[PDB]
Amino acid sequence: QMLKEMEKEVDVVDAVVRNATLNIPNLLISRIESEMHRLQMDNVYEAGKVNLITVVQLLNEALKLVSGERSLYDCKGVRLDLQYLHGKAKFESEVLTRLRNMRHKIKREDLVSIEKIIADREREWERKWEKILGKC
Amino acid sequence: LAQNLPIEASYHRFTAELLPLAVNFIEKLEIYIKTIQTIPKIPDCASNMDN
Amino acid sequence: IAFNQIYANEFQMSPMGPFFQFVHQSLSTCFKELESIAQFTETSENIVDVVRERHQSKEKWAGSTISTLCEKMKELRQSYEAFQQSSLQD
Amino acid sequence: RDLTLLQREERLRDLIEKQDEVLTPVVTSKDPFKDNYTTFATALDSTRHGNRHRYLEELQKHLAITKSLLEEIMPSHASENAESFDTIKDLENIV
User: Fold this and answer.
1) Residue A81 backbone zone (phi > 0: left; psi -120 to 50: alpha; other: beta)
2) Per-residue exposure over D66-92, b if at least 16 CB sit within 10 Å of its own CB, e if not
3) Could you say which residues form the signal peptide (chain D)?
4) Which spans in chain C are helix H?
5) Backbone dihedral angles phi then psi of residue A45, each to the nearest 5 degrees
6) Do B14 and C24 touch (CB under 8 A)?
7) With contact defined as beta carbons under 8 Å apart, do A3 and B4 qualify?
8) Nearest Cβ partner of A15 from D48, D55, D78?
9) What is the DSSP string of A47-86?
10) How far apart are the first and last CA of chain B?
11) How far is B1 from chain D (nearest CA, A)?
């Protein structure tokens, strides 16, 4: 009885247990140009090599933009209910299987039986009248 | 539940991969911003789909 | 016993290495999250279109008349209702 | 008849004794386990829904900003959202 009552919990637990060319977007360029006085940034490429500090600086600016946008459109943080999506995919899959089973039942069981009966009946009929008429 | 460059060898990986990651983020910034703008429509999208 | 013990006790060189690890892992997670939100929106819209097309599309299913799947199915249902009614009045 | 019944009862006793010896410790530790495990599982379930030295010092200053921005931008469920991507794609294909 104890093992049976703990099944749901086990499941939850199981679920848990189981060449650097940089194209800078216009939005970031516009931001860097507007704040150019404040942002003392070196060239991304110095002596033909990538300046990692500049890249990180650009990354920081990009992240600020992202922070601004998230504060406007995702104040509470959007949660995609993973359980909802799994429940829906599983259900629709069941619907697909039901349709296939129905079609297979119609094609392999129901139509084969009916076609055999039709063929027997058509032959019995042709034989009966061929005998009575002496011709087809 | 509770929630050469002189770098220590245990962290070489994180240091080497950070560059590409940063580049990729910067390049896809506009896409990430559009995506964030669509976040208020996500409940409507879910209802229409259910219907 | 081992679980109960762990549950009671636990569940109930430049200094730059840790900064790299943190920034790397946090940035990666951020990427994946935004991609997932974008995909949900796209999928939801595609599904609405596919179903709409199926309800409005007219095709020659049987005979000489063009009809939607829903109309032809209704016609077929009415026909067998009519056949069944004619058999109960027998 | 008496001999045959006695032989069978002896066999039954031997079997019960062997089982009692091993079941008694498990039943006594059950209730503390079940309660600790359930509380644990419920808690877990709620979470799912120049000079080179000088150079590394300058870099640290900027990575520290990065670290602060990422801590600010990242929602509490960001990791869960990131795991939903495959499931969404599967749903579309099935439909």
Assistant:
1) beta
2) bbebbeebbbebbebbbebbebbebbb
3) none
4) 2-6, 17-56, 69-88
5) -115, 115
6) yes
7) no
8) D48
9) TTEE-HHHHHHHHHHHHHHHHHHHHHH-TT-----HHHHH
10) 37
11) 6
